[PDB]
Tab-separated table of C-alpha atoms and ligand atoms in Angstrom:
chain	number	residue	atom	x	y	z
R	6	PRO	CA	-0.113	0.020	0.036
R	7	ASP	CA	1.077	3.510	-0.845
R	8	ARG	CA	-0.947	6.091	1.170
R	9	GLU	CA	-0.525	9.135	-0.640
R	10	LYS	CA	-1.695	7.404	-3.704
R	11	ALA	CA	-4.404	5.563	-1.802
R	12	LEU	CA	-5.525	8.830	-0.743
R	13	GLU	CA	-5.482	10.855	-3.871
R	14	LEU	CA	-7.615	8.107	-5.289
R	15	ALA	CA	-10.191	8.311	-2.654
R	16	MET	CA	-10.215	11.938	-2.575
R	17	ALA	CA	-10.892	11.833	-6.338
R	18	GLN	CA	-13.655	9.531	-5.958
R	19	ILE	CA	-15.217	11.465	-3.030
R	20	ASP	CA	-15.186	14.869	-4.977
R	21	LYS	CA	-16.532	13.255	-8.185
R	22	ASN	CA	-19.525	11.742	-6.024
R	23	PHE	CA	-20.138	14.725	-4.093
R	24	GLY	CA	-18.800	17.896	-5.688
R	25	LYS	CA	-15.313	19.355	-5.929
R	26	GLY	CA	-14.400	20.695	-2.697
R	27	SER	CA	-16.222	17.847	-0.853
R	28	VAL	CA	-12.827	17.316	0.761
R	29	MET	CA	-9.389	19.279	0.694
R	30	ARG	CA	-6.240	19.864	2.657
R	31	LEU	CA	-6.412	23.077	4.586
R	32	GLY	CA	-2.964	23.933	3.289
R	33	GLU	CA	-4.041	23.648	-0.370
R	34	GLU	CA	-2.889	26.041	-2.832
R	35	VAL	CA	-5.975	26.526	-4.903
R	36	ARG	CA	-5.949	27.215	-8.710
R	37	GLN	CA	-9.495	27.114	-10.100
R	38	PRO	CA	-10.580	30.517	-11.701
R	39	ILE	CA	-14.195	30.366	-10.405
R	40	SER	CA	-16.121	33.644	-11.095
R	41	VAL	CA	-16.463	35.737	-8.073
R	42	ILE	CA	-18.165	38.883	-6.475
R	43	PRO	CA	-15.268	40.784	-4.578
R	44	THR	CA	-16.441	41.140	-1.079
R	45	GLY	CA	-15.430	44.828	-1.172
R	46	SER	CA	-12.426	43.752	1.300
R	47	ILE	CA	-9.026	42.550	-0.031
R	48	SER	CA	-8.453	40.910	3.135
R	49	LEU	CA	-11.586	38.955	3.143
R	50	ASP	CA	-11.354	38.092	-0.540
R	51	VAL	CA	-8.005	36.441	0.020
R	52	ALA	CA	-9.407	34.670	3.089
R	53	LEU	CA	-11.964	33.050	0.765
R	54	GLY	CA	-9.183	31.770	-1.306
R	55	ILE	CA	-10.995	32.688	-4.625
R	56	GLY	CA	-11.026	36.577	-4.271
R	57	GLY	CA	-14.498	37.142	-3.615
R	58	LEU	CA	-17.941	35.308	-3.073
R	59	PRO	CA	-18.553	32.492	-5.363
R	60	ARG	CA	-21.016	33.109	-8.060
R	61	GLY	CA	-24.278	30.931	-8.209
R	62	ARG	CA	-23.857	29.900	-4.761
R	63	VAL	CA	-25.677	30.515	-1.336
R	64	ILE	CA	-23.954	32.612	0.787
R	65	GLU	CA	-24.523	33.182	4.678
R	66	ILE	CA	-23.417	36.117	6.342
R	67	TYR	CA	-24.379	35.859	10.154
R	68	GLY	CA	-23.420	37.628	13.513
R	69	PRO	CA	-24.698	40.276	15.860
R	70	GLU	CA	-26.195	43.503	14.423
R	71	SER	CA	-23.660	46.265	13.581
R	72	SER	CA	-20.694	43.980	12.741
R	73	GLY	CA	-20.272	44.955	9.076
R	74	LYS	CA	-22.492	42.225	7.305
R	75	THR	CA	-24.848	44.467	5.336
R	76	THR	CA	-21.956	46.510	4.448
R	77	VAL	CA	-20.326	43.576	2.896
R	78	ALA	CA	-23.560	42.573	1.342
R	79	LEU	CA	-23.887	46.195	0.000
R	80	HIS	CA	-20.130	46.543	-1.306
R	81	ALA	CA	-20.545	43.031	-3.239
R	82	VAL	CA	-24.094	44.413	-4.852
R	83	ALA	CA	-21.945	47.391	-6.089
R	84	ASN	CA	-19.229	45.316	-7.474
R	85	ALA	CA	-21.644	43.230	-9.129
R	86	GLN	CA	-23.207	46.133	-10.742
R	87	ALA	CA	-20.088	47.706	-12.012
R	88	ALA	CA	-19.424	44.666	-13.793
R	89	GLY	CA	-22.895	45.405	-15.675
R	90	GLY	CA	-24.704	43.071	-13.203
R	91	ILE	CA	-28.566	43.343	-12.234
R	92	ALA	CA	-28.988	43.048	-8.255
R	93	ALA	CA	-32.139	42.378	-6.185
R	94	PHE	CA	-32.714	43.118	-2.706
R	95	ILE	CA	-35.291	41.061	-0.882
R	96	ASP	CA	-36.293	43.236	2.223
R	97	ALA	CA	-38.182	41.797	5.058
R	98	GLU	CA	-36.689	44.127	7.640
R	99	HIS	CA	-37.243	47.679	6.085
R	100	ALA	CA	-33.758	48.823	7.265
R	101	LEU	CA	-31.729	49.411	4.053
R	102	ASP	CA	-30.509	53.111	3.815
R	103	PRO	CA	-30.049	53.457	-0.217
R	104	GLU	CA	-28.097	56.666	0.756
R	105	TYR	CA	-25.419	54.804	2.539
R	106	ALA	CA	-25.806	52.115	-0.093
R	107	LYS	CA	-24.979	54.711	-2.853
R	108	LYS	CA	-21.980	56.034	-0.543
R	109	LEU	CA	-20.618	52.421	-1.088
R	110	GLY	CA	-20.933	52.450	-4.920
R	111	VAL	CA	-24.448	50.774	-5.217
R	112	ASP	CA	-26.335	52.249	-8.029
R	113	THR	CA	-29.726	52.180	-6.190
R	114	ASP	CA	-31.975	53.343	-9.026
R	115	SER	CA	-31.331	50.078	-10.833
R	116	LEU	CA	-31.647	47.903	-7.814
R	117	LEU	CA	-34.605	45.735	-7.622
R	118	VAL	CA	-36.186	45.856	-4.036
R	119	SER	CA	-38.887	43.696	-2.719
R	120	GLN	CA	-40.897	43.869	0.654
R	121	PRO	CA	-42.796	40.642	0.948
R	122	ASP	CA	-45.739	40.020	3.025
R	123	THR	CA	-44.984	36.460	4.184
R	124	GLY	CA	-41.586	34.512	4.463
R	125	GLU	CA	-42.833	32.246	2.057
R	126	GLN	CA	-43.733	34.976	-0.605
R	127	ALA	CA	-40.185	36.397	0.190
R	128	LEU	CA	-38.392	33.220	-0.762
R	129	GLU	CA	-40.786	32.611	-3.788
R	130	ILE	CA	-40.083	36.094	-5.247
R	131	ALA	CA	-36.296	35.542	-4.792
R	132	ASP	CA	-36.835	32.229	-6.530
R	133	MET	CA	-38.893	33.742	-9.340
R	134	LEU	CA	-36.156	36.617	-9.885
R	135	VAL	CA	-33.232	34.025	-9.792
R	136	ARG	CA	-34.468	31.811	-12.572
R	137	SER	CA	-34.809	34.362	-14.981
R	138	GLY	CA	-30.957	34.177	-15.242
R	139	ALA	CA	-31.038	38.096	-15.214
R	140	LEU	CA	-29.143	38.594	-11.831
R	141	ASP	CA	-25.838	38.524	-10.906
R	142	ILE	CA	-26.477	38.834	-7.209
R	143	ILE	CA	-29.549	38.762	-4.652
R	144	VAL	CA	-29.517	39.653	-1.352
R	145	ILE	CA	-31.967	38.512	1.341
R	146	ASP	CA	-32.389	40.700	4.445
R	147	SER	CA	-32.876	39.140	7.865
R	148	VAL	CA	-33.146	35.165	7.864
R	149	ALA	CA	-35.096	35.557	10.949
R	150	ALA	CA	-37.710	37.740	9.359
R	151	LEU	CA	-38.857	35.103	6.961
R	152	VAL	CA	-41.554	34.301	9.352
R	153	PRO	CA	-44.146	31.775	8.133
R	154	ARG	CA	-47.502	33.146	6.657
R	155	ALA	CA	-49.278	31.165	9.317
R	156	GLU	CA	-47.635	32.938	12.204
R	157	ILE	CA	-48.017	36.179	10.478
R	158	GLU	CA	-51.705	35.701	10.420
R	159	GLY	CA	-52.915	34.820	14.083
R	160	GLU	CA	-52.369	30.998	14.278
R	161	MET	CA	-52.065	29.443	17.600
R	162	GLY	CA	-51.750	25.838	18.016
R	163	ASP	CA	-50.270	26.715	21.582
R	164	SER	CA	-46.972	25.394	20.572
R	165	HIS	CA	-47.540	25.273	16.644
R	166	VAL	CA	-44.609	23.628	15.141
R	167	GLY	CA	-41.076	24.219	13.611
R	168	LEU	CA	-42.331	25.504	10.201
R	169	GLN	CA	-40.204	28.325	9.447
R	170	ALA	CA	-37.141	25.759	9.290
R	171	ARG	CA	-38.891	23.660	6.804
R	172	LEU	CA	-39.649	26.927	4.969
R	173	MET	CA	-36.004	27.748	4.552
R	174	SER	CA	-35.235	24.067	3.613
R	175	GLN	CA	-37.802	23.399	0.786
R	176	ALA	CA	-37.039	27.019	-0.568
R	177	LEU	CA	-33.340	26.439	-0.741
R	178	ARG	CA	-33.814	22.903	-1.840
R	179	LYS	CA	-35.370	24.119	-4.997
R	180	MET	CA	-33.643	27.634	-5.517
R	181	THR	CA	-29.887	26.529	-5.225
R	182	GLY	CA	-30.152	24.467	-8.344
R	183	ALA	CA	-31.544	27.496	-10.368
R	184	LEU	CA	-28.908	29.722	-8.608
R	185	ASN	CA	-26.188	27.098	-9.956
R	186	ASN	CA	-27.747	27.316	-13.632
R	187	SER	CA	-28.237	31.288	-13.315
R	188	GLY	CA	-24.948	31.796	-11.596
R	189	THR	CA	-26.437	34.228	-9.291
R	190	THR	CA	-25.088	34.581	-6.036
R	191	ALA	CA	-27.479	34.509	-2.960
R	192	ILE	CA	-26.245	36.224	-0.068
R	193	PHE	CA	-28.442	35.546	3.274
R	194	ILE	CA	-28.050	38.086	5.889
R	195	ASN	CA	-28.455	36.328	9.429
R	196	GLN	CA	-29.053	38.914	11.966
R	197	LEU	CA	-28.175	37.043	15.334
R	198	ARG	CA	-29.899	38.286	18.446
R	199	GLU	CA	-31.077	38.216	21.963
R	200	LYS	CA	-27.962	37.869	24.262
R	201	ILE	CA	-27.516	34.183	24.111
R	202	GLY	CA	-28.974	30.986	22.933
R	209	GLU	CA	-24.773	30.038	13.632
R	210	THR	CA	-28.641	29.733	13.424
R	211	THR	CA	-31.852	31.588	13.132
R	212	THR	CA	-34.617	29.066	12.317
R	213	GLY	CA	-33.788	28.915	8.678
R	214	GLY	CA	-30.010	29.315	9.454
R	215	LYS	CA	-30.295	25.686	10.280
R	216	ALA	CA	-31.135	24.444	6.740
R	217	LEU	CA	-28.699	27.475	5.381
R	218	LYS	CA	-25.836	25.670	7.380
R	219	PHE	CA	-26.003	22.800	4.903
R	220	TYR	CA	-27.157	24.646	1.691
R	221	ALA	CA	-24.518	27.395	1.639
R	222	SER	CA	-21.157	26.910	-0.243
R	223	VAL	CA	-19.609	29.934	1.926
R	224	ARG	CA	-20.544	30.791	5.425
R	225	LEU	CA	-19.414	34.194	6.898
R	226	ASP	CA	-19.009	34.715	10.659
R	227	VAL	CA	-18.983	38.693	10.802
R	228	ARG	CA	-18.385	40.195	14.231
R	229	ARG	CA	-17.448	43.481	15.707
R	230	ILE	CA	-14.242	43.627	17.322
R	231	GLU	CA	-13.050	47.197	17.983
R	232	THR	CA	-14.014	50.672	17.967
R	233	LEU	CA	-11.907	52.723	15.794
R	234	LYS	CA	-10.330	55.803	17.169
R	235	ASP	CA	-7.477	58.340	17.252
R	236	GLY	CA	-7.658	59.154	20.884
R	237	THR	CA	-11.035	59.312	22.169
R	238	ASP	CA	-11.942	60.237	18.550
R	239	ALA	CA	-13.975	57.520	16.639
R	240	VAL	CA	-15.748	57.237	13.377
R	241	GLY	CA	-16.397	53.392	13.057
R	242	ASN	CA	-15.208	49.977	14.210
R	243	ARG	CA	-12.937	47.176	12.970
R	244	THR	CA	-14.733	43.931	11.974
R	245	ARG	CA	-13.323	40.394	12.023
R	246	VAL	CA	-14.949	37.970	9.636
R	247	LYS	CA	-14.284	33.948	10.071
R	248	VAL	CA	-14.896	31.996	6.795
R	249	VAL	CA	-16.152	29.018	8.849
R	250	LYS	CA	-17.462	27.365	5.925
R	251	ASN	CA	-15.752	26.859	2.292
R	252	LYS	CA	-16.913	24.254	-0.058
R	253	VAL	CA	-14.818	26.153	-2.903
R	254	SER	CA	-11.523	26.922	-0.996
R	255	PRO	CA	-9.751	25.515	2.378
R	256	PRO	CA	-12.112	26.968	5.042
R	257	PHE	CA	-11.392	28.341	8.398
R	258	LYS	CA	-9.321	31.346	7.677
R	259	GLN	CA	-9.869	34.969	8.752
R	260	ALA	CA	-9.744	38.561	7.691
R	261	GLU	CA	-10.128	41.992	9.429
R	262	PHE	CA	-10.904	45.575	8.308
R	263	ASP	CA	-12.198	48.975	9.399
R	264	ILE	CA	-15.581	50.502	8.360
R	265	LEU	CA	-15.650	54.027	9.306
R	266	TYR	CA	-18.995	55.567	10.070
R	267	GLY	CA	-21.090	56.838	6.967
R	268	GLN	CA	-18.222	55.105	4.945
R	269	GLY	CA	-17.881	51.311	3.778
R	270	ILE	CA	-14.787	49.166	4.411
R	271	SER	CA	-11.607	51.634	4.263
R	272	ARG	CA	-9.583	50.453	1.245
R	273	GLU	CA	-6.381	52.409	2.685
R	274	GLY	CA	-6.907	50.762	6.118
R	275	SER	CA	-6.836	47.254	4.397
R	276	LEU	CA	-3.755	48.543	2.278
R	277	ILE	CA	-1.955	49.332	5.671
R	278	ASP	CA	-3.024	46.186	7.318
R	279	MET	CA	-1.829	43.783	4.514
R	280	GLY	CA	0.956	46.059	3.631
R	281	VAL	CA	2.616	45.461	7.129
R	282	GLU	CA	1.927	41.928	7.773
R	283	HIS	CA	3.474	41.454	4.106
R	284	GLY	CA	6.299	43.650	4.952
R	285	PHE	CA	5.719	46.266	2.115
R	286	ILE	CA	5.220	48.864	4.708
R	287	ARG	CA	7.544	48.956	7.767
R	288	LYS	CA	5.676	49.465	11.110
R	289	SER	CA	8.202	50.561	13.537
R	290	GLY	CA	6.499	51.145	16.716
R	291	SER	CA	4.250	54.095	16.461
R	292	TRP	CA	5.260	55.161	13.307
R	293	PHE	CA	4.617	53.840	9.637
R	294	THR	CA	7.122	54.012	6.471
R	295	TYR	CA	6.870	52.887	2.829
R	296	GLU	CA	10.325	52.833	1.214
R	297	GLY	CA	11.719	55.607	3.115
R	298	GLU	CA	8.671	57.796	2.893
R	299	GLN	CA	6.972	58.478	6.253
R	300	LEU	CA	3.152	57.540	6.579
R	301	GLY	CA	2.826	59.147	9.786
R	302	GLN	CA	2.416	58.116	13.548
R	303	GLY	CA	-0.981	56.525	14.033
R	304	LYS	CA	-2.961	54.058	11.752
R	305	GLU	CA	-5.277	57.240	10.936
R	306	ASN	CA	-2.541	59.435	10.000
R	307	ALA	CA	-1.182	56.663	7.588
R	308	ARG	CA	-4.730	56.072	6.584
R	309	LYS	CA	-5.117	59.734	5.686
R	310	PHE	CA	-1.707	59.944	4.327
R	311	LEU	CA	-2.664	57.234	1.946
R	312	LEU	CA	-5.724	58.908	1.122
R	313	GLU	CA	-4.185	62.105	-0.069
R	314	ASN	CA	-1.174	60.373	-1.747
R	315	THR	CA	-3.107	58.208	-4.097
R	316	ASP	CA	0.174	57.425	-6.157
R	317	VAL	CA	1.335	55.684	-3.107
R	318	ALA	CA	-1.335	53.242	-1.981
R	319	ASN	CA	-1.940	52.392	-5.666
R	320	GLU	CA	1.767	51.169	-5.835
R	321	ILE	CA	1.560	49.668	-2.305
R	322	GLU	CA	-1.902	47.920	-3.612
R	323	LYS	CA	-0.077	46.609	-6.728
R	324	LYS	CA	2.703	45.199	-4.571
R	325	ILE	CA	0.252	43.586	-2.334
R	326	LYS	CA	-2.117	42.215	-5.274
R	327	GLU	CA	0.954	41.067	-7.105
R	328	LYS	CA	2.468	38.964	-4.186
R	329	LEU	CA	-1.109	37.200	-3.915
R	330	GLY	CA	-3.783	37.182	-6.553
R	331	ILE	CA	-2.629	38.061	-10.071
R	332	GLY	CA	-4.083	37.202	-13.512
R	333	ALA	CA	-4.770	33.402	-13.251
R	334	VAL	CA	-5.027	30.671	-15.771
I	1	LIG	N1	-27.199	53.580	7.346
I	1	LIG	C1	-25.863	53.894	7.636
I	1	LIG	N2	-25.351	55.057	7.733
I	1	LIG	C2	-24.130	55.362	8.089
I	1	LIG	N3	-23.404	54.255	8.345
I	1	LIG	C3	-23.825	52.938	8.490
I	1	LIG	C4	-25.018	52.773	8.080
I	1	LIG	N4	-25.342	51.302	7.981
I	1	LIG	C5	-24.072	50.971	8.252
I	1	LIG	N5	-23.200	51.908	8.643
I	1	LIG	C6	-21.656	51.647	9.142
I	1	LIG	O1	-21.577	50.280	8.831
I	1	LIG	C7	-21.290	49.498	10.141
I	1	LIG	C8	-21.987	48.167	10.191
I	1	LIG	O2	-23.190	48.175	9.771
I	1	LIG	P1	-24.029	47.126	9.151
I	1	LIG	O3	-23.149	46.153	8.483
I	1	LIG	O4	-25.367	47.301	8.258
I	1	LIG	O5	-24.672	46.187	10.377
I	1	LIG	P2	-24.958	44.881	10.368
I	1	LIG	O6	-23.653	43.665	10.662
I	1	LIG	O7	-26.208	44.205	11.440
I	1	LIG	O8	-25.346	44.342	9.021
I	1	LIG	C9	-22.043	50.412	11.111
I	1	LIG	O9	-21.463	50.390	12.349
I	1	LIG	C10	-21.636	51.807	10.563
I	1	LIG	O10	-20.046	51.994	10.752
């Protein structure tokens, strides 16, 4: 017996029977193009292994409110649009701020929005839009807000049943195939609430249907020195059927703004040694970026020439023109 050979032969059958990515080595150096929608976060794109959210798949972005989920979802929509894509937003929360969305580059006018009467209706409308093949991306707001018609209308069986989960099951069971054929990426936003208790009724069916699952979370409030703007987010790719999972990314979303490009450039620039972080100060090839991630953030903002050559250097070192 020759283990490594016997193994590849197994993995081969494993994948052929259940799909590419059925099994893989955490340390894999992946080489499949696989059309993506840039998360709006460079770090998150790399963490995903394919440079963004896979197209034609079900994506779940779960986490506590205010952790950055909708922002990513919105940045994704903006990116799909820029590539001449058509986006749809199934809204069951009534929270979306189109203004903030425009700010993230979303063309709100061409954005389809639906505000369903019941959970059923909501997924059914999503399913219809999907199989028309016209959509590149479709975001469903709040997994939990997809409450069953029967619950919406007064219907007390004292204890009723576990219907909403089945609602998300049967719905994903028939949508996935269409998404695959259509190539539309379905992002489900899962707002986790209530202090204590990866799921929200349908998030249990979502757990198995998703090809990518993002654990978004707020880990820090950004500052100067008691000055704030917005917080830093940490995302954990807990499920990745297209690349080795369990990776992580971080980024800053300043208040009123989306993901800070410059921030990502400083972060990755340092960890990838392109920019030199000497204690309090930041430097890029002799040039002083300033003392304080913010000043450096600002510096990079003003000197667009730098940043771009830095972005270039980081981009090259990682994801370049493949195939
Ligand atoms: N409508 C808005 N106006 C200004 N800033 C916003 C707005 N929505 C979101 N933000 C910024 O994005 C951050 C994350 O918000 P969001 O991603 O919508 O929360 P969630 O994780 O529940 O989807 C907010 O803390 C804020 O920094």
